[PDB]
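Inputs:
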Amino acid sequence: LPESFDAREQWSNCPTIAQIRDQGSCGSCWAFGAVEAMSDRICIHTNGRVNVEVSAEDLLTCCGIQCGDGCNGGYPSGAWNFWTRKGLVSGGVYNSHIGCLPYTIPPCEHHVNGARPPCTGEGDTPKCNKMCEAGYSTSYKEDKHYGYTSYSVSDSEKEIMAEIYKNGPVEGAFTVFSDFLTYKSGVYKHEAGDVMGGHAIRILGWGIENGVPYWLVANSWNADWGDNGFFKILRGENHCGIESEIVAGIPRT
Amino acid sequence: LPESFDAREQWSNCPTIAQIRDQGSCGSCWAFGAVEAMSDRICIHTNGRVNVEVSAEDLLTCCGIQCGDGCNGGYPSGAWNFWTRKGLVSGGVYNSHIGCLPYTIPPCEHHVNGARPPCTGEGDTPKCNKMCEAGYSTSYKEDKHYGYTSYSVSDSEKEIMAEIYKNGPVEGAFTVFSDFLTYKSGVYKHEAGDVMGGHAIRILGWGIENGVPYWLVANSWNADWGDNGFFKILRGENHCGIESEIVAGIPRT
């Protein structure tokens, strides 16, 4: 296995892999981490032939109790589970107007002095409407994209690495401390600050930066957070349980 | 698979299965759900031959950063990794003087009234003393028992059940609300309640209360909290994440 890896280089024809989104003022990081990596994988699974942004709207509103409690938080493995069964329509970003269900919660500043509104506390969850936005060609039903299988990956570096290399990006989670919130670049290790909680993310590569091994990680706090919305985190010593909740799946053909 | 199951009667030769520990004033439930399930497994796998209380003290204090922040909380999957690599010594309950390193943190009252002092959040992590207590027949390095494997179990009801039924109780986790804290009897469904955090526990069976399918769970809050130390929580609904984070392993024997 190579000394570093990027899903975006390895599968450059797939655009969603370089994309960064915004969950807004809603705790849908469980939903985002999932729908991001599904998009990457549908594309990867099809040599590019299929290129869908899978909807964060669909999963967040329509999943139910299995995924947890919506904008108040949720469970990744419920996400991929719902995907293998009820499956997931496409949906661009806020006012993208692409696919079936574009995401309907606005972008905001996540701990950064920008020009968009302040995010403020987890939004409330919207209802589930089994119908694509008006203008979209096919219906919700016909627009579903299915998972064939989903699974948890074990706490083993080499294993989480083999998975990203062979099947594309995965979903992870980790404890979040205050000192995280103002990350800018380099490799995040924890030193200071209080607990804030788990928070789900999409892992898309690994590498070494000045002696230090890392996971390359996409956050859903838009691109003016961190390193263009991405970040690196210590790899190897379960740092913040980053290696404890890897979940993944294979798209149906 | 059976419609009902109890590891406690499946392997009645295996006493640790029926035992409720007390974690005391320390957030070491991640440690307690693992050594508990590990003991159960060492007993089941050697068919009776080896019977030990695996030490909570050793895990909690000597595992380090791969497991978390000790008494402030940690990560089940880093516990089972530790076992497979560095091993765990024998330790019974507080003032048992059984085994190498018995637990050094006092039993207390956990969201109940009782004869014992109230628990506290304030819980320092005892240091990693790599010495068996005085009297113990065998030295610390000698008394270590090792994991052969550690693995995450996928979010599948039918798959979780079959792991237990074929291999022993498991460790797992769920999101705790405040309505949980005052449970007594019956099957847990989260109705009301506010969010309090994760809780790592040990699952040892399943069944059906009045139509309601549930999982049999050992808490580590002593026996006067709840149903003699155990509780039932609903099944098949990833309810409060119960089917989301299951970890296990096979003893080296």
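The two ends of chain A are 27 Å apart (CA to CA). Flag for discussion at group meeting.
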